[PDB]
Amino acid sequence: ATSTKKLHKEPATLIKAIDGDTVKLMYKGQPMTFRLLLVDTPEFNEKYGPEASAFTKKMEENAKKIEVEFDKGQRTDKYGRGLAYIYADGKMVNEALVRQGLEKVAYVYKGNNTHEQLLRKAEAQAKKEKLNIWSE
Numbered sequence: 001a002t003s004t005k006k007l008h009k010e011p012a013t014l015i016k017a018i019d020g021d022t023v024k025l026m027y028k029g030q031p032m033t034f035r036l037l038l039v040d041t042p043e044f045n046e047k048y049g050p051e052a053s054a055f056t057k058k059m060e061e062n063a064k065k066i067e068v069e070f071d072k073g074q075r076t077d078k079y080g081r082g083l084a085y086i087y088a089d090g091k092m093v094n095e096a097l098v099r100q101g102l103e104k105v106a107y108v109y110k111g112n113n114t115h116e117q118l119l120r121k122a123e124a125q126a127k128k129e130k131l132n133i134w135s136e
Ligand SMILES: Cc1cn([C@H]2C[C@H](OP(=O)(O)O)[C@@H](COP(=O)(O)O)O2)c(=O)[nH]c1=O
Pocket: 022, 035, 036, 037, 038, 039, 040, 077, 078, 083, 107, 109, 112
């Protein structure tokens, strides 16, 4: 097993919704592009990209409160995007995407794996429902 750590949620504000799994936030007083941990558009099914983007745009734009939760590993990727779990009024966007079959679990690195089993639980249930990306 990996080490484990207690993560915490930090304040941020929405600057702009980008797509399913990218969002631009004001974090510690500066704009920052964030990439959501542990999710991607399926390699072999991209039909739901627009719906995924619309979904997270609405969720992020309607939220009263956005929070960023970094994991225990790398805080930025090779492009200098933040890597985080993003919360909208306490709801984890990453988890919502997966439960709704709008993106799949992906980019699972041992370093930033704290909510892996949570998201896999959500995925297994979307897959059981043959929902959206899982429909064929
Ligand atoms: C989610 C995530 C993506 N990435 C990188 C892998 C991919 O690199 P490459 O660009 O070299 O393929 C890229 C995919 O991001 P996008 O899916 O936003 O394009 O982000 C990480 O390095 N760590 C992560 O945790």
